[PDB]
Design a protein around this nucleic acid. Sequence first.
RNA 1: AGGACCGAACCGACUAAUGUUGAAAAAUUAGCGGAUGACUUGUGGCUGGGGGUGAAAGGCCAAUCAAACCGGGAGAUAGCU
RNA 2: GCUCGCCGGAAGACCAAGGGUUCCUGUCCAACGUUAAUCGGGGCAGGGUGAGUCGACCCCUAAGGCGAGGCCGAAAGGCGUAGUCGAUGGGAAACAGGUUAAUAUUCCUGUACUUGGUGUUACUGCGAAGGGGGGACGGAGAAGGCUAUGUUGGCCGGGCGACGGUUGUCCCGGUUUAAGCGUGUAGGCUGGUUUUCCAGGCAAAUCCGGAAAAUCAAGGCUGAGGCGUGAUGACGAGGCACUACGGUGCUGAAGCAACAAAUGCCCUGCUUCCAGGAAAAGCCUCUAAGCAUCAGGUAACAUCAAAUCGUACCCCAAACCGACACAGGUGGUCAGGUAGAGAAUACCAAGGCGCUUGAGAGAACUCGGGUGAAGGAACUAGGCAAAAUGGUGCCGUAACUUCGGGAGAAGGCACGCUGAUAUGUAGGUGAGGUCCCUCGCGGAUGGAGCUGAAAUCAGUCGAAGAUACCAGCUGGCUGCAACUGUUUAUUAAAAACACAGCACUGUGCAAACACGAAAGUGGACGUAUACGGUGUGACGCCUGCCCGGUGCCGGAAGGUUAAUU
Lengths: 93, 271, 46
Amino acid sequence: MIREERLLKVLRAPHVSEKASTAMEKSNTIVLKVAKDATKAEIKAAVQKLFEVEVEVVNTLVVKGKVKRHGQRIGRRSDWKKAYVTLKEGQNL
Amino acid sequence: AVVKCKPTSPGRRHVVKVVNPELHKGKPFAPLLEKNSKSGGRNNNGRITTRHIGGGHKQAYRIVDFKRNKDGIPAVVERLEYDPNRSANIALVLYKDGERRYILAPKGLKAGDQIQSGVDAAIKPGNTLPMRNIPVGSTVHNVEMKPGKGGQLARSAGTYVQIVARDGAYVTLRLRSGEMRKVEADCRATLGEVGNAEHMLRVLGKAGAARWRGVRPTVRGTAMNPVDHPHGGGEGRNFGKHPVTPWGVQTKGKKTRSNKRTDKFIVRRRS
Amino acid sequence: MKRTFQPSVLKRNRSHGFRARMATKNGRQVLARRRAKGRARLTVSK
RNA sequence: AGGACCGAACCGACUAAUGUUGAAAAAUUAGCGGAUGACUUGUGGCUGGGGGUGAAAGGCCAAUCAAACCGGGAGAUAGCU
RNA sequence: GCUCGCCGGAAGACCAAGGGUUCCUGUCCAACGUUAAUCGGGGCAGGGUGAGUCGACCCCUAAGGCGAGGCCGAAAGGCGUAGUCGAUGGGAAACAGGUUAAUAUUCCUGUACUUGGUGUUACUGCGAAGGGGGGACGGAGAAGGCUAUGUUGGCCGGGCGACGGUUGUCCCGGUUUAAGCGUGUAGGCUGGUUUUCCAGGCAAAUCCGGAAAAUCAAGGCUGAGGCGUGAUGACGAGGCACUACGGUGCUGAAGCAACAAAUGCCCUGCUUCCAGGAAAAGCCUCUAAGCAUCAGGUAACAUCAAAUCGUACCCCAAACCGACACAGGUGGUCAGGUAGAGAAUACCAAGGCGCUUGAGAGAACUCGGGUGAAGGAACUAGGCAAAAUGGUGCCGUAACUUCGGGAGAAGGCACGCUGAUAUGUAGGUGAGGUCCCUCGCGGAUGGAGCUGAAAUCAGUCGAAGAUACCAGCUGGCUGCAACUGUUUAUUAAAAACACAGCACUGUGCAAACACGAAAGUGGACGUAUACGGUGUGACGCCUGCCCGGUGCCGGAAGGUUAAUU
Ligand SMILES: [K+]
Ligand SMILES: [K+]
Ligand SMILES: [K+]
Ligand SMILES: [Mg+2]
Ligand SMILES: [Mg+2]
Ligand SMILES: [Mg+2]
Ligand SMILES: [Mg+2]
Ligand SMILES: [Mg+2]
Ligand SMILES: [Mg+2]
Ligand SMILES: [Mg+2]
Ligand SMILES: [Mg+2]
Ligand SMILES: [Mg+2]
Ligand SMILES: [Mg+2]
Ligand SMILES: [Mg+2]
Ligand SMILES: [Mg+2]
Ligand SMILES: [Mg+2]
Ligand SMILES: [Mg+2]
Ligand SMILES: [Mg+2]
Ligand SMILES: [Mg+2]
Ligand SMILES: [Mg+2]
Ligand SMILES: [Mg+2]
Ligand SMILES: [Mg+2]
Ligand SMILES: [Mg+2]
Ligand SMILES: [Mg+2]
Ligand SMILES: [Mg+2]
Ligand SMILES: [Mg+2]
Ligand SMILES: [Mg+2]
Ligand SMILES: [Mg+2]
Ligand SMILES: [Mg+2]
Ligand SMILES: [Mg+2]
Ligand SMILES: [Mg+2]
Ligand SMILES: [Mg+2]
Ligand SMILES: [Mg+2]
Ligand SMILES: [Mg+2]
Ligand SMILES: [Mg+2]
Ligand SMILES: [Mg+2]
Ligand SMILES: [Mg+2]
Ligand SMILES: [Mg+2]
Ligand SMILES: [Mg+2]
Ligand SMILES: [Mg+2]
Ligand SMILES: [Mg+2]
Ligand SMILES: [Mg+2]
Ligand SMILES: [Mg+2]
Ligand SMILES: [Mg+2]
Ligand SMILES: [Mg+2]
Ligand SMILES: [Mg+2]
Ligand SMILES: [Mg+2]
Ligand SMILES: [Mg+2]
Ligand SMILES: [Mg+2]
Ligand SMILES: [Mg+2]
Ligand SMILES: [Mg+2]
Ligand SMILES: [Mg+2]
Ligand SMILES: [Mg+2]
Ligand SMILES: [Mg+2]
Ligand SMILES: [Mg+2]
Ligand SMILES: [Mg+2]
Ligand SMILES: [Mg+2]
């Protein structure tokens, strides 16, 4: 059993974009920013416990942070993980 | 048999091959095969320690029974085979208990011949015995230098040793080199000569045939510069020095045997 | 024409990487010298 | 069958012209040699500096080779400019 | 947007390596872009990479690396055993269609497959660090069966033509469909089964190996492709409908045959040769300790699981290696048409581009080309360069020769198109039909239809028919090196190096020799028909005299002679 303290930390934010909205409106999939060390199983248990919806499957990918210049000083944004979470067809998230 | 190639190309004009139709045409006996990967003449330091070795065809090692230790159980020759690791042909023999072994193939040995080892064996080619049981004056091959160690003398194609005399615990052998050598009379020897005596009649014919055997080119010392070889240098073809190895030791007549530990076993040097 | 630097990450890491440096006392002295100079990047690993 | 023949890919580099503050710190163009072999190529590995490797040209060993490169002895020494 | 032009075995497409956001969208034009720039691989902001099946990770090993103890070494360290790492190799599994501005074998639809964990029910001998099998392996060549793919016809939709003709033997377009499952075919290999016995497989074995009888005569393994199914589906020329003119939504015809055909597949096959062609695991099987109506094995069905990391984009290049948006370099895969032997070459398709300064002018001179009266090597160091030859079939071809060659020697004739032979021939392919059948992807006959060289004879146009691109110049004497190879990366390719062959010499195996204070390692898991060193350099005829000097080999009397005493 995955702990509630662990589940309360693995979902960081909903992800907002046209691809995310099309996913939600076309295939019942929510797009979330998640902890970089999170697994698909943790993500599934967390979205089921903390959003009270039923989860079909979780697809995940790592987004590489961009190299940027601030006043012509080089830095790098952080990597993060994105979860495509497919719900069970009647779940209303 | 020995056969000349027709001169249909300059690389074929001088080829003389030794073709033996009795040799097994197919694959060797798998349970006696081992990998032997090549050295390039380099040791565990990665340095070339013997020049002129490299490339050539891939070869599998055949486990050959040089000890001939299965005493008292006859074997029958199944087939003679080509062995890429040596000049002699080998013979796959089947022991009456069901074990198969490879042996050096002696002259005259063919599929269906019966062989045996041990003090009780008949005196016929292919049979192995301690040399105390072998008549004086016999021709043997694959001769042991220490009892139980395995054959070490007269193993190359067409070679053999003559038992010249027996005196106590030692036999005296005339080696193929011409040397007279003492060996313990308990040491074993197989009767007859090594087969494939035509091996030396072959003519490679072209440089590539030497390369197929893993033999890389020899550069003459006099073709080099002084920094590379004592023979190096000269404006034109010059020599004017006593011939030496690349490391400066005289190489026309100077003796190098230095073994006081085994001198006692030499009766007469090869001459 | 073929120039001298033909990159390969595997060969780079095996030849000059942190663990190759650590594998021998002379490599470890390389790392000591670079740490004492204050290099931001000790090896090709990063 | 063949270190066989003609000939693309592929590997080379005999001739000429161009180029020579180049398109290029060795190329381009027209021709040229090998092209089943002692062939050629990818990936990885081993050999380390009086050492390696060399079908041998003192060739090659990171555009560096009759002794690599980096640091040190080191402000070598310089009856010379 | 319309024209034009260029590549098309690439200048198209997909990747690996390498790079790392260069990808898409909005916005900006200072700098960067060899010009301008409204544009960009430039600035800024946002977005974008979705996997049980692809790859990594993982299991397994190669070369090699590291290496407990160990052996060795002033120290540092060297080597190496048991082991443990190490892919460039072996090992489970997914395809077609649709979709985004940007991902997809990853999302969606449809249809599949693999391994493992538990839970039932049934039948049970299960058990490995061990034994056996299998995995499992070369070069070349030959041929047959196939498919990818193409062409033509049929079919279906459309068309009737800017200028003579075009309802036809006319024109344009389409005619696609997977894995999986069933079938076990062309074809390859192998005799099969039952019992008994046994010095072998470190012990055991019911497994393998061996031996013995009996009996059956086809059993078994493997196998492209085809056919059926998947699919009453998908797609689909086009039509319609809107469109923020970038494209979207709807609808949907035919969807067959014959012929040709790979370098791909059967094929890890077959044939043949010598130079004689990885390993280990997965997998199968056998037993040992042991467990022993348990565990556990097999089987079916049910349920759960298959994590994690990569996935954008360039990738013969403006994104990689070359300081550059650099005429260089970079491994793999895909492979249409006409002509052609062809992956050459020309022109094209799909697809992609016109190379990030232009506009004029029409001097010398330079560069890259075209043509040239008469002469034709007079040029020059030298025919340098250029010009020339150039294909196929047939005729024909000298000296010399190692009998293979020389040789494509040299030289010559034919060559386009049309008609007939023969409304399309020799040949290749092959339907219907029939007959037999150990009954199917069967055999025997039969030949419609399709495809189709070459020749002969006659005719005919041009100056010219191998018409373009493409494509040997030939001969005579002679030096050197036998030859194919190798070489001064970047002024030398040669006569130099190598070479097969020859000879001398060392070397008896703990070999000589080489690397190494050493342990060791190579030589070699070789053994004098072997191995090292040296010189010579295919082959033919040969290789004469000198041992005084220097070296090497042998001698061992006598002289001289170290440490030591
Ligand atoms: K010389
Ligand atoms: K010289
Ligand atoms: K040096
Ligand atoms: Mg999914
Ligand atoms: Mg993923
Ligand atoms: Mg040698
Ligand atoms: Mg030689
Ligand atoms: Mg020289
Ligand atoms: Mg010298
Ligand atoms: Mg001279
Ligand atoms: Mg002289
Ligand atoms: Mg050839
Ligand atoms: Mg070269
Ligand atoms: Mg060229
Ligand atoms: Mg030639
Ligand atoms: Mg050629
Ligand atoms: Mg010189
Ligand atoms: Mg250099
Ligand atoms: Mg020096
Ligand atoms: Mg000093
Ligand atoms: Mg100074
Ligand atoms: Mg950027
Ligand atoms: Mg862009
Ligand atoms: Mg401006
Ligand atoms: Mg500008
Ligand atoms: Mg940009
Ligand atoms: Mg190893
Ligand atoms: Mg070690
Ligand atoms: Mg230790
Ligand atoms: Mg491993
Ligand atoms: Mg691999
Ligand atoms: Mg894309
Ligand atoms: Mg077909
Ligand atoms: Mg081929
Ligand atoms: Mg992509
Ligand atoms: Mg440019
Ligand atoms: Mg470029
Ligand atoms: Mg290339
Ligand atoms: Mg072309
Ligand atoms: Mg002009
Ligand atoms: Mg001119
Ligand atoms: Mg002209
Ligand atoms: Mg003229
Ligand atoms: Mg004229
Ligand atoms: Mg004339
Ligand atoms: Mg003249
Ligand atoms: Mg003159
Ligand atoms: Mg010329
Ligand atoms: Mg010309
Ligand atoms: Mg002369
Ligand atoms: Mg030559
Ligand atoms: Mg040549
Ligand atoms: Mg040069
Ligand atoms: Mg040159
Ligand atoms: Mg040894
Ligand atoms: Mg010579
Ligand atoms: Mg000569």
